[PDB]
Amino acid sequence: STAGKVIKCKAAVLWEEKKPFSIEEVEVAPPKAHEVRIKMVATGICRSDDHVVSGTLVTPLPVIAGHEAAGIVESIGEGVTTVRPGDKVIPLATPQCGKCRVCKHPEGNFCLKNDLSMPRGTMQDGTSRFTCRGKPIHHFLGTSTFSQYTVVDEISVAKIDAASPLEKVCLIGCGFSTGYGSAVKVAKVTQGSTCAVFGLGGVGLSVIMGCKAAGAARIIGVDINKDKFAKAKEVGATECVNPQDYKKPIQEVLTEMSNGGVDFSFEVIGRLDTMVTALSCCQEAYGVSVIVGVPPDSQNLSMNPMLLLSGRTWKGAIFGGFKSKDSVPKLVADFMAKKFALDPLITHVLPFEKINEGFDLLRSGESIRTILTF
């Protein structure tokens, strides 16, 4: 068959920053002990993948990017117990080793085996499974889903329901779960509360979905692209505001709208200025602000700590606070049980070969999530 053998397949290789992806043939080694080789079925285009192209996020190149996906197990290495050939799976960009102090903590999810804090771009064993034109190619976040086949560590993959539609549930691999959990789990939005959400992309829409599910009475969407407002209202924004329409800074506008500050605010963009704005707009004695967006590499923000001394809480999270391997199958089960919707996030579905076109739709403001199909 293909098990135990090198696979030659198509992938999208990023050779350098700020260039289009190159679609070409790569060789994918078979999985070693505690590794899983996956035939991809669908992958989403997340703004974080674009951060790798833009240099906003630094990771070793050349690289196969992509992290929000779903596929089917082709083969397993020795010692693998949690998935089998033929299983539907979602790769986990935040792993769950189950052994580190974070995995063992009731509230921690940022497993210490992650490849985000100090990226190496390899498997856990420090080597790569990918070659292209005779050269080794790096992995990204232990996932690398812009390829017909990938290899992942077992701690970076979850088995999901055999009947799930992979072309939708790939979003549970990153953007949906990130936004929804940021609201319900990280902020712990309360019934009757007022919320402000900065950035109305796939992730911000998912934060709105969570705020609405948590029973917020008011959800104010904030974006400089007013074409984003109709969909934000559809998924539960009660009002939308464009900072460019006001003479005053938007923190002041939001503080006035909310009669002295909002209960919960969320930065879902990745800009330092909006992080400080979002903080400021929450009520000074009991407000909570959650950073979800990823800002550029190695840049510090400036703020007045009196913002905090009066009582505000400021926090951030990766992947909505969800312990990844425990939560992903449950979220897919909840989707199958119609507990939330994913279609509002999906604006375009393209063949994999049109990856560059998909990125152009995101950069231009025209898409939310484009799903690529293999």
Ligand X SMILES: NC(=O)c1ccc[n+]([C@@H]2O[C@H](COP(=O)([O-])OP(=O)(O)OC[C@H]3O[C@@H](n4cnc5c(N)ncnc54)[C@H](O)[C@@H]3O)[C@@H](O)[C@H]2O)c1
Ligand Y SMILES: OCc1c(F)c(F)c(F)c(F)c1F
**Active-site annotation, residues:** 46, 48, 51, 67, 174
Using rule CB under 8 A, residue 112 touches its own copies: yes
Residue 286 binds which entry of ligand Y, ligand X, its own copies, none, CB below 5-8 Å type-dependent: its own copies
Q: Does 121 bind ligand X (CB under 6 A)?
A: no
Q: Are 201 and 221 in contact (CB under 8 A)?
A: no
Out of 20, 85, 108, 243, name the contact with its own copies by CB under 8 A. 108
* d(C-alpha 57, C-alpha 106), whole Å: 29
Among 173, 201, 236, 261, binds ligand X (CB under 6 A): 201
Tell me which residues in 241-300 interact with ligand X (CB under 6 A).
243, 268-271, 274, 292-294
Name residues contacting its own copies, limited to 234-293 (CB under 8 A). Answer: 259-260, 272, 275, 283-286, 291-292
How far apart CA 106 and CA 132 sit, in angstroms, is 42
Measured between alpha carbons, how far is 193 from 211 in angstroms, rounded to an integer? 9
Q: Which of 100, 213, 272, 350 binds Zn ion (CB under 5 A)?
A: 100
Instruction: Please pick, from the candidates 151, 171, 203, 372, the single residue that binds ligand X as defined by CB under 6 A.
Output: 203
* CA–CA distance, 42 with 342 (Å, rounded to integer): 14
Q: Which residues contact 83 (CB under 8 A, 6 or more apart)?
A: 36, 73, 76, 89, 154, 157, 159
Q: Cα(90)–Cα(332) distance, rounded to whole angstroms?
A: 10
Of 96, 128, 164, 193, which lies in the binding site for ligand Y, with binding defined by CB under 6 A? 128
How deeply is 63 buried, as exposed, middle or buried, from its count of CB atoms within 10 A (0-12, 13-18, 19+)?
buried
H-helix or E-strand spanning residue 43: strand 35-44
Tokens of 315: 């926090």
> Which stretches of the chain bind ligand X, using CB under 6 A?
46-48, 51, 174-175, 178, 198-204, 222-225, 228, 243, 268-271, 274, 292-294, 309, 318-319, 365
Q: Which residues make up each annotated binding site for Zn(2+)? A: 46, 48, 67, 97, 100, 103, 111, 174
Q: Which residues make up each annotated binding site for NAD(+)? A: 48, 199-204, 223, 228, 292-294, 319, 369
